Write an enzyme that holds these catalytic residues in place. Structure first.
Site, PDB file in Angstrom:
ATOM      1  N   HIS C 143       2.701  -6.939   3.220  1.00 36.08           N
ATOM      2  CA  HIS C 143       3.261  -7.081   1.880  1.00 36.08           C
ATOM      3  C   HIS C 143       4.630  -7.739   1.846  1.00 36.08           C
ATOM      4  CE1 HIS C 143      -0.103  -4.960   0.295  1.00 36.08           C
ATOM      5  NE2 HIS C 143       0.236  -3.829   0.876  1.00 36.08           N
ATOM      6  N   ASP C 180      -6.873  -5.057   5.926  1.00 38.64           N
ATOM      7  CA  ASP C 180      -6.256  -3.967   5.166  1.00 38.64           C
ATOM      8  C   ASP C 180      -6.802  -4.078   3.736  1.00 38.64           C
ATOM      9  OD1 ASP C 180      -4.005  -2.989   3.212  1.00 38.64           O
ATOM     10  OD2 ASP C 180      -3.313  -2.155   5.069  1.00 38.64           O
ATOM     11  N   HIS C 182      -5.525  -3.619   0.885  1.00 32.59           N
ATOM     12  CA  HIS C 182      -4.581  -4.152  -0.086  1.00 32.59           C
ATOM     13  C   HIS C 182      -4.330  -5.631   0.211  1.00 32.59           C
ATOM     14  CE1 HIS C 182      -3.746   0.215   0.368  1.00 32.59           C
ATOM     15  NE2 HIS C 182      -3.982   0.116  -0.930  1.00 32.59           N
ATOM     16  N   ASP C 268      -7.424   1.326   5.667  1.00 30.28           N
ATOM     17  CA  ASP C 268      -7.360   1.936   4.331  1.00 30.28           C
ATOM     18  C   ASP C 268      -8.577   1.574   3.453  1.00 30.28           C
ATOM     19  OD1 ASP C 268      -6.078  -0.570   4.353  1.00 30.28           O
ATOM     20  OD2 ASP C 268      -4.253   0.257   3.361  1.00 30.28           O
TER      21      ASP C 268
HETATM   22  O1  LIG Z   1       3.873   1.301  -4.714  1.00 27.44           O
HETATM   23  C1  LIG Z   1       2.732   0.996  -5.012  1.00 27.44           C
HETATM   24  C2  LIG Z   1       1.620   1.238  -4.003  1.00 27.44           C
HETATM   25  C3  LIG Z   1       2.026   1.040  -2.550  1.00 27.44           C
HETATM   26  C4  LIG Z   1       0.776   0.902  -1.653  1.00 27.44           C
HETATM   27  C5  LIG Z   1       1.183   0.206  -0.379  1.00 27.44           C
HETATM   28  C6  LIG Z   1      -0.003  -0.117   0.555  1.00 27.44           C
HETATM   29  C7  LIG Z   1       0.619  -0.529   1.881  1.00 27.44           C
HETATM   30  C8  LIG Z   1      -0.328  -1.075   2.984  1.00 27.44           C
HETATM   31  O2  LIG Z   1      -1.333  -0.160   3.321  1.00 27.44           O
HETATM   32  O3  LIG Z   1      -1.158  -2.145   2.545  1.00 27.44           O
HETATM   33  C9  LIG Z   1       0.472  -1.477   4.236  1.00 27.44           C
HETATM   34  F1  LIG Z   1       1.338  -2.425   3.943  1.00 27.44           F
HETATM   35  F2  LIG Z   1       1.068  -0.409   4.755  1.00 27.44           F
HETATM   36  F3  LIG Z   1      -0.339  -1.968   5.140  1.00 27.44           F
HETATM   37  N1  LIG Z   1       2.335   0.460  -6.189  1.00 27.44           N
HETATM   38  C10 LIG Z   1       3.085   0.203  -7.329  1.00 27.44           C
HETATM   39  C11 LIG Z   1       4.450   0.517  -7.488  1.00 27.44           C
HETATM   40  C12 LIG Z   1       5.115   0.193  -8.678  1.00 27.44           C
HETATM   41  C13 LIG Z   1       4.431  -0.436  -9.723  1.00 27.44           C
HETATM   42  C14 LIG Z   1       3.082  -0.749  -9.586  1.00 27.44           C
HETATM   43  C15 LIG Z   1       2.419  -0.440  -8.398  1.00 27.44           C
HETATM   44  K   LIG Z   2      -6.096  -7.549   2.957  1.00 31.40           K
HETATM   45 ZN   LIG Z   3      -2.993  -1.210   2.931  1.00 34.44          ZN
END
Ligand SMILES: O=C(CCCCCCC(O)(O)C(F)(F)F)Nc1ccccc1
Ligand SMILES: [K+]
Ligand SMILES: [Zn+2]
Ligand SMILES: O=C(CCCCCCC(O)(O)C(F)(F)F)Nc1ccccc1
Ligand SMILES: O=C(CCCCCCC(O)(O)C(F)(F)F)Nc1ccccc1
Ligand SMILES: O=C(CCCCCCC(O)(O)C(F)(F)F)Nc1ccccc1
Ligand SMILES: [K+]
Ligand SMILES: [K+]
Ligand SMILES: [K+]
Ligand SMILES: [K+]
Ligand SMILES: [K+]
Ligand SMILES: [K+]
Ligand SMILES: [K+]
Ligand SMILES: [Zn+2]
Ligand SMILES: [Zn+2]
Ligand SMILES: [Zn+2]
Lengths: 368, 369, 369, 368
Positions: C143, C180, C182, C268
């Site tokens: 990210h 992943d 996400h 995940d």
């Molecule tokens: O904070 C989050 C979700 C965070 C999830 C992170 C996933 C991290 C990951 O697994 O891919 C890895 F990077 F660890 F791999 N969302 C929001 C916050 C504010 C407003 C809208 C949405």
């Molecule tokens: K991905």
């Molecule tokens: Zn993730």
């Protein structure tokens, strides 16, 4: 060359959901995530050995499972068979006394714990290594010949001493146990035997409740070759170092062991919940330095440390690290609790502490 | 208007062991862990939020009273009750039957308080002392069939409550609506042949149990037509759940005319639950509760009792549960702090597969007489 | 055949605080909790299983070496690096930028070791010392875009590794495959204008980030066509993921002919993860890994490096990760103890909506030259 | 009628991810789930009060947030304003000394803690209740007039005493603090003031490091109305009960307070990590019985217990429950650790313990 034993499964010992005994609803003992003896305490010591950089100065030694033959040098066949049985139960179960349980498959870990002590002993005794630390779990020193007791399944230091005697042919071995609780198991195993000198420093009547008196001296040919140094609650660095200088080191020099095994618990620390003693990391440092130097003088440096108890996940890692640093000679991290604990005391030899130690001095002459 | 609320300290003391789901097992290399998936902290955090949010000030606390053998036998066999006594008397506790779920020593005390909390709340709503309530019980109930424990459940709390309403209060018709994400197989089993308890389960299709919860499972004999399963696909969210409420659940309740509605209120359909794949948010559960409470007002003088089932997010479950409590009290005083985070993830559009799954059940409504 | 493995004790010491996702907050009534969703224990349990299973005996341990400023600047801006130094120097740590994710004091040391673990493994695979490997790093990377930290990520580990392969090893083409669950928005951003790093992301559509990961995000300038997003619907399981591998990912890699494949390996997408709604099992990840390793053997002399991204089930992630390690070592010595439990839940049939989502990307393959 | 205060937020105090100070990577202090002072210890006491059935014999009293006016009877305006500031920081922050942090919004809990002590004091003093226990958190007794210290934000017992003096018009109040650490904060607040007799029993130099000597006796009109009883490490039931009989109870009888407030910590317990004392649940039971009976004799039974420290999540609940049972007169649950701990000692008055206590006896004559 300094050996170091850790095995992942040492951190997987299942201590249940109770505090000490099992959780019990009728008694209103609420379940809790971390039993007093939870493996995280020792795992945090291992992780500090790595994160501090000490691991780079150590030779990692893989544990090798203790065989039945190894175990039978310290324990009865009935005890070994009962541990096989309990380990095979689907949930694990009662190891004999109704307090300490063993989790399912737990025998595997108990063999690796005793076997880690044996493997390190083998490598130090044969000259592959000069010394080492076996950071084992479960602990050993309460397990007598015929039973498990006090979180201990097998008496790791006795299995190692038995190996040194029978396999390596050493005629004299010493086990020095500075875990804060009495090494009743070790005392029992070698009670009649002068070829293993057993020394225990401990808080008087802390655990077990009815043992560790200065009058417990062995029997038959072994009379005189068990030495208990019960100390009063509140004893700290001054008492422990006085015990080292007046009793322990003179006993070792009189006995002339060919190998020293240290049952190294850190439950005498200032922050331990399971005793009332005041030793700091600097105290353990000095105890280790003195014992390692004694080994250099009398048995070509052959000293093996084997983890016993200790129940502060906060502080035990720094007490253990101090001992590791004395083995490696690399003193690269401060004790971050030093200022906090140094003002609390324990650094003056009190009259009652001095007297407790002096009780044992006349027994030194019977170590031939 | 007086809203009952049951919490008992021992609901937070259920001993779930040192495994994740099954016990820890060294040969399998399942490492011990502090919190089993079903650890009681999840539900205790819900209770603590009810208190800390100030909702507790708008609730009438109702003490659990231990379910008697007679109470339990209205939902379960004598052999099952005797087996739970046996297991509870073992020094470490033990296997409740299925080989997965254990029960800790003396755990029967908590199982009786859990069922008894549901009964006590049901009694006090049915008399008119209370208008409605929420029994935040643990252990859960809906997987335990007549003759066994299953799926973390020792006794079927909502069925013990329904059995009480039928036999002690003389109600002729009771409905149990189960929106826990897993199939209420236990409840289905208990009332299978019995039209006097309408059993409805919304659930993720084949999530748990594995062989169970099909739309073709409709009861038997005089009970044929008085069990309704609404299996939904993984990924279903607020739109699916509210469409199921509007097309199936509420029409079923109106057709049946229960004298009391008992809701098996799990929150394991939430967007953050590890034990299912659904996308319901706290606002979704809020709307589900509002609809059901309003239905009770229309058809059974407001007599509605919510009884906690599952839910496995210690982070989010408290806010899902609090939304339901707020619909009962009418005091809407705390935001869902996860709303922005979760609202963008979806679930708010009715997908064709979701619509079709729900429409499968609509022709069964005509058999509810 | 020699398989590298990176674990550093400090990967297990990442301080995730006392909140669940954002910090604990009393006014919001977010109660403190021992384990944040992203607590390092999840990944440490994976490491411990690698050891306890005996896989460690078949691996060559590779020490992490801290990423230098020069290493980091191949993926990130100087302003970002300086901001991470600043935050790491604050006495308690602090806000890394987004207001959600904090970094603990001195935490830059661990971020450098995480990126550096990926670099070290990449170096040793690219020389032929090792044939392949797995870097079990933490904190994660995918990210973090060029100019910021985001989503628990401080530095983009796989992009630091790719930057090293490009600039230090002189590789002309590198591929980063991110499974992943996400969207790899950070990786996409870093290489947006650059055709020398093909970036592929499979992910749950709009899971995180909220506004990101559409199939229309394809790069720019000379990089147009060299970013491929495969957004999948909630509830997608093994069948969808393997269809995506076969229809999109493997053909993309074969068209591109990278000299090295880096896999952003999150777990995940597992059936038990709280932070997404997918249904992949350990056997699914096994098949994904096997396919990718075999592709590397065919097109880039086996040069494949796996780098840990996310995954939030401390119970199940270890078995998903172990499946991947076993595909690298070829030693398949432990069952998945959750197999029976999860296999009945579904995900093993390719649904029409899943097929359609994947087919959306197939016409983009022709633009990979 | 016995009052009992618990508030959910007492269990939500955010103690961070360190052990004592914050986790610190350079120092290699690994993060840990439970800080030594984690609120679970006190929450487990509350849950035992409920699960034991004691709650049925108690009158639950809701905490009412301490106002600024309430706080200013014990503390400076600058201190109050600084706590407002720190509480408003997005992560919380440093409360002044760099060791103990306060979490975000934490002032809300600190007001409820002080306010729980005030509310119970009000109800006992006015005769609504005969006595009670306020199971508050965060603790109070280390916070002096102008600062937070030692996990304490506001001095709860001093806020309550200030209220009894100013609002209820009591002329004399006593604060008896048997937390194992010196009540330096309470000593500081009432140093010049004879209208609040401050008594502290504690392990000598445990915390803070430089205070709690017998020579700290107050100043001006307050000279003679602060009494410190420093005890040696290892002191147990015999020492504590001898201190009660020789010093504490005679001091209270000499002073004739109109209300007794007990700063009730359980960190003198046999299993506490943060001190080296040996008190058991039966010891605390006897201490409470003696103090409640003293209140019956001298101030119409007006006694309020206010929770201070204690760090054994295993054992503290049973120590606290013993005190609750002495208030209710319903003695319905055994201490399940009794057998385990009773053999460890502390039940004989040692010469050094006796002498420490006798040091304070000549100071009783200055309590007029
Ligand atoms: O904070 C989050 C979700 C965070 C999830 C992170 C996933 C991290 C990951 O697994 O891919 C890895 F990077 F660890 F791999 N969302 C929001 C916050 C504010 C407003 C809208 C949405
Ligand atoms: K991905
Ligand atoms: Zn993730
Ligand atoms: O169970 C105990 C205390 C157990 C303390 C074990 C200490 C173990 C150890 O650290 O020395 C080591 F071995 F781990 F090293 N006592 C009872 C139980 C029942 C009745 C009376 C007393
Ligand atoms: O054990 C499980 C999953 C158990 C999930 C229980 C859910 C309980 C519940 O939330 O509905 C409630 F009841 F708590 F509400 N499955 C197996 C085991 C063996 C073989 C196949 C599947
Ligand atoms: O921080 C400490 C020890 C804190 C111990 C607090 C005890 C608190 C308490 O139980 O009495 C009660 F208030 F909670 F009741 N000492 C230092 C720190 C830095 C340098 C030297 C010494
Ligand atoms: K001997
Ligand atoms: K000893
Ligand atoms: K039915
Ligand atoms: K259901
Ligand atoms: K690109
Ligand atoms: K005074
Ligand atoms: K004190
Ligand atoms: Zn010990
Ligand atoms: Zn469920
Ligand atoms: Zn204290």
């Amino acid at each position: 060359a300094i050996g170091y034993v850790w095995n992942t499964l040492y951190g997987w010992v299942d201590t249940g959901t109770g505090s000490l005994a099992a959780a019990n609803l009728t008694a209103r003992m609420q379940p809790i995530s971390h039993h007093l003896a939870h493996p995280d305490t020792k795992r945090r010591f291992h992780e500090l050995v790595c994160a501090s950089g000490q691991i780079e100065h150590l030779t990692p030694i893989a544990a090798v499972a203790a065989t039945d033959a190894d175990i039978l040098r310290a324990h009865s066949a009935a005890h070994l068979e009962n541990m096989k049985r309990v380990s095979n139960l689907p949930t694990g179960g009662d190891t004999g006394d109704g307090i300490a349980m063993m989790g399912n498959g737990g025998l595997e870990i108990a063999r690796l714990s005793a076997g880690g002590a044996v493997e390190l002993t083998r490598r130090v005794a044969t000259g592959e290594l000069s010394a080492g630390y076996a950071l084992v779990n479960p602990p050993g020193h309460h397990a007598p010949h015929n039973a498990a007791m006090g979180f201990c399944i097998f008496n790791n230091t006795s299995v190692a001493a038995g190996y040194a005697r029978a396999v390596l042919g050493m005629e004299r071995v010493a086990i020095l146990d500075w875990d804060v609780h009495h090494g009743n198991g070790t005392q029992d195993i070698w009670w009649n035997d002068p070829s293993v000198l057993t020394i225990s420093l401990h808080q008087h009547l802390c655990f077990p409740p009815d043992s560790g008196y200065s009058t417990e001296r062995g029997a038959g040919n072994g009379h005189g070759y068990n030495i208990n140094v019960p100390l009063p609650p509140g004893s700290g660095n001054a008492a422990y170092l006085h015990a080292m200088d007046q009793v322990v080191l003179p006993a070792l020099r009189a006995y002339r062991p060919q190998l020293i095994i240290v049952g190294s618990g850190f439950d005498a620390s200032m922050l331990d919940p399971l005793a009332r003693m005041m030793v700091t990391a600097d105290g353990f440092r000095q105890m280790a330095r003195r014992t390692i130097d004694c080994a250099a003088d009398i048995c070509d440096g052959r000293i093996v440390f084997v983890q016993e108890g200790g129940y502060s996940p906060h502080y035990l890692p720094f007490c253990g690290l101090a001992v590791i640093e004395e083995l490696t000679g690399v003193r690269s991290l401060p004790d971050p609790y030093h200022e906090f604990l140094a003002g609390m005391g324990g650094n003056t030899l009190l009259d009652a502490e001095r007297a407790a130690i002096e009780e044992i001095v006349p027994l030194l002459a019977d170590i031939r």
